[PDB]
């Protein structure tokens, strides 16, 4: 049904319409490339304002209606776990590949020759990256050059003023939850929380689990050195339901009887913590005033009003289990911790619970601070980009010089190997060499320099001067050769940037018909 009111696009003009749907996405994000990338204003659906230039926030928030532009949204679900640094880089690469393919479509070449020709030239550019890559941590492990490379990818944003102490934190967080010889870094084992107030220098590395809940009473001790934590859902008190107790009393004969019936329950379940051997009582609900007076005398602290996901996040790090009531209390499901402390922040009444193990754990949490809440969500993503580069260093310590140095040397090898291809895929190989030069050309355009004058000077430098590649001066430094300026990208991040860009042009050029049924 519904044949009337249906948009159709077929013929040769549907091929250029899919190019124009992809050219609108690339031209917006060719200005936000590099550390000198221009900011983007985001207007929320309810009226909030948040400004950023990150690539992963652009693709997730751009409510596009074209299905060709919706295919550009799909690459962000798999790229942020792989490269983390070239989200703006693959969009301009997929767009500029279709720019020269728009010129190739005027000649009459079929897109199944262009999609196969782009896959042919991508294997030459991938092979050229492995020949020019240099190692860092071959045959040994070291933590000193890993912080220097992490200082460059972190300081590309506004958090460059405190990039030193935050780069040492992300190195020790990955090395605790994961080993370098195992090469299995888990992103779910590293959590990042934050609260308003303070500076960026007050970032502390908590090896364990943090929850934003205080103790059940202000007279509770703030130091638990014993590794026995009972995590339950019902507090050690007379039993109350989940929503509303609503105890009915008739007269003073029922109030006197229910008080003695509650005084037995106030004496039993409080002393039921000592028969098992637990010290901390993390319960989902709070405690009463009569229970808090008894917890002070027996030296047993407790955490009140712990939320839904806050319970399960503690028991994974400490190795505990969600206990439903007091009858299932065993010593095997009790949590383990080295230091449970409460840390306040000035006059703020947050008083979060800091559970530390004081050892090499398997779940580490990072608490960042700042003067505004928009900087805390920016610094969380800033450390998340730093976690992927260290993850790429563990899987492969070989690295390649970024900042346009790897892109120009790849364009020289592809154009040299294009003459050895005596078929109709030769024009697609020369198309791949021209689109590879656009990413270092957009780097110099965002820096305020002439884009063509800056590009061809490195062409005479990477050929006539020296065979090692030289970078493009993007941060207005003294000279070229960004290897001396310590701006180096990863090899896996540069190989998958080429492969994902070829994958999206192959899926776009093969699509030649769209049918959109409207309303009836």
């Amino acid at each position: 049904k519904d044949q009337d009111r249906k948009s159709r696009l077929m013929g040769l003009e549907a091929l250029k319409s899919h190019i124009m749907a992809a050219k609108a996405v690339a031209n917006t994000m060719r200005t936000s490339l590099g550390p000198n990338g221009l900011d983007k204003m985001m207007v929320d659906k309810d009226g909030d304002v948040t400004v950023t230039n990150d690539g992963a926030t652009i693709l997730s928030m751009m409510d596009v209606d074209h299905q060709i532009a919706k295919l550009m949204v799909e690459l962000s679900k798999s790229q942020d776990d792989e490269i983390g640094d070239g989200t703006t880089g693959v969009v301009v690469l997929a767009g500029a590949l279709l720019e020269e393919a728009e010129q190739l479509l005027d000649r009459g070449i079929h897109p199944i020759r262009i999609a196969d020709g782009y896959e042919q030239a991508a294997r030459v550019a991938i092979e050229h990256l492995d020949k020019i890559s240099d190692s860092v941590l071959v045959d040994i492990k070291d933590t000193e050059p890993l912080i220097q490379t992490a200082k460059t990818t972190l300081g590309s944003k506004v958090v460059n003023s405190c990039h030193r102490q935050m780069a040492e934190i992300a190195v020790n967080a990955v090395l605790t939850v994961a080993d370098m010889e195992r090469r299995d870094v888990d992103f779910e084992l590293i959590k990042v929380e934050g609260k308003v107030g303070g500076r960026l220098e007050d970032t502390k590395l908590i090896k364990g689990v943090i929850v934003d809940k205080d103790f059940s009473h202000p007279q509770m001790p703030k130091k638990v050195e014993d590794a026995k934590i009972a995590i339950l859902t019902c507090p050690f008190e007379p039993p109350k339901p989940k929503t509303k107790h609503k105890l009915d009393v008739t007269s003073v004969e029922d109030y006197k009887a229910l008080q003695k019936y509650e005084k037995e329950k106030f004496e039993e379940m409080i002393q039921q913590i000592k028969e098992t051997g637990a010290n901390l009582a993390i319960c989902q609900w709070g405690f009463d005033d009569e229970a808090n007076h008894l917890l002070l005398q027996n030296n047993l602290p407790a955490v009140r009003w712990v939320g839904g996901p806050e319970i399960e996040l503690i028991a994974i790090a400490t190795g505990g289990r969600i206990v439903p009531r007091f009858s299932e209390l065993t010593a095997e499901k009790l949590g383990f911790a080295g230091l449970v402390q409460e840390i306040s922040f000035g006059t703020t009444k947050d008083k979060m619970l800091v559970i530390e193990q004081c050892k090499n754990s398997r779940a580490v949490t990072i608490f960042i601070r700042g003067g505004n809440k928009m900087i805390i969500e920016e610094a969380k993503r800033s450390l998340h980009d730093a976690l992927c580069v260290i993850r790429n260093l563990i899987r492969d310590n070989r690295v390649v010089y970024g900042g346009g140095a790897a892109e120009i040397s790849c364009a020289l090898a592809v154009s040299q190997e294009a003459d050895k291809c005596p078929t109709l895929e030769q024009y697609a190989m020369r198309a791949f060499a021209d689109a590879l030069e656009v990413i270092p050309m957009a780097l110099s355009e965002n820096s305020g320099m002439n884009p063509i004058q800056t590009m061809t000077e490195v062409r005479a430098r990477q050929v006539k001067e020296m065979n090692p590649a030289l970078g493009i001066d993007c941060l207005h430094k003294g000279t070229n050769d960004m290897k001396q300026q310590h701006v180096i990208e990863t090899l896996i991040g540069k190989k998958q940037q080429i492969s994902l860009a070829t994958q999206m042009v192959r899926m776009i050029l093969k699509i030649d018909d769209i049918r959109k049924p409207g309303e009836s």
Partner: protein, 519 residues
Amino acid sequence: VILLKEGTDSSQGIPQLVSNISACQVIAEAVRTTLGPRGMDKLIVDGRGKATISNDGATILKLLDVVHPAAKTLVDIAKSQDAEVGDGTTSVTLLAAEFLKQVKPYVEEGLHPQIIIRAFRTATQLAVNKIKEIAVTVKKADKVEQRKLLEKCAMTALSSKLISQQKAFFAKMVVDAVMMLDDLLQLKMIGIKKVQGGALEDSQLVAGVAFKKTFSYAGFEMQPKKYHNPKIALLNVELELKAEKDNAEIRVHTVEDYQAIVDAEWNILYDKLEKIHHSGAKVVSSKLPIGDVATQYFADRDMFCAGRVPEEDLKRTMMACGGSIQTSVNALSADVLGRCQVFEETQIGGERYNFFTGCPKAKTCTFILRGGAEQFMEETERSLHDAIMIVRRAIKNDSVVAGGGAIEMELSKYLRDYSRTIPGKQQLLIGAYAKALEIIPRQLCDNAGFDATNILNKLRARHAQGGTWYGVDINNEDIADNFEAFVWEPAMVRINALTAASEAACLIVSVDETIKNPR
């Protein structure tokens, strides 16, 4: 003021047929470029806003739904093509409209459509006898085993692909997967799963049923994987402590029943776990997610549990284990339980995967893909599904013909030579029927990006010299012998595609007036 129609849509004559011939070509234009293994895919979006990316001709016509009357006559032929042979909807849709295109100038000159009906019944009946003469039975030719021949046809079908370098490993796995099945071959029995990460060498072939196992809840360090004869249970019940469907809310104002209220809510979970313990099910498979409390139950009772299983993988497990899918828990007994010989939790690809091996009804398999992208594995899944299809038809039908337009250019040469010896109105129509059959080697050159006129002029010159099995090549930009290059197709599907394309072309020509009732 007295009208005979009064809203009745009706017209007859010659231009009613010309309006029906040109309306047939809009359906062929929707599946013109999807012909061939290197064809272009179409983008179809439904009313919900979900974009579907596929190049299969059966999936395109099922989502087109054109309200034209002559367009609906090409739908049920594609439906009958799935019942007669199993596939070939994009071949009979393109071939039906090109029969009407060549006779479209002949109708306008005053020729009656019933004479074109008598020519389509004649030349198709000659095409049935001509196919069976050239079709050779290759069963034990040149004393080579059939396992070596089945790896050769899958090598050409998987050529010029992502796994074209390692095609020697992928050709040996698609043969043993069909060899693991019974005599009743089916494409639905062999499932394909994808595992992200790793190189292409780490692809494995599961002899039984393996699923994704997205169960990411608790339950580590217990529940041992190795079981000799476990009882496979297929459930659809949620085993969480605080479930969205299984709860108990009673509003009393007594403190004595408040302990019993939480105990009664736990007894909903506990009695549903105790019935699995009485039935003896060593492995627990459920569609709904399983909580962390139920994982502690089977840990001490020496059993395994794994939730978040899709219902498609549960039905493949039912066909493998031979049991039945039970939604409730009180009806769980040995009549619906399964059995297998080897069950283990593997760590292939970094994630946990469960698979059974050694079932009494082990007629299903699972193919595991490894690669750096899911869209790399998505096109590999469709290419390996195409590699299974060529292997499966070679086992069922031994009498095969050369594909790649070799049987289409040979039928175009014989029907042209028969038309020169027939006087009357059957010369210009059957001679146009032979030229209309040349659209299969022509669209194979168009979708592959080759020169469509440079190959087809050399292909007909090769058939004029005596070449009977020469066609187009998808790898090389020249003609090649498809019988020597193991590009085959059975004779029965080529016959049934011709009698379906001629019947679809005859139903359009025999229609001259359209009757519409006003309602």
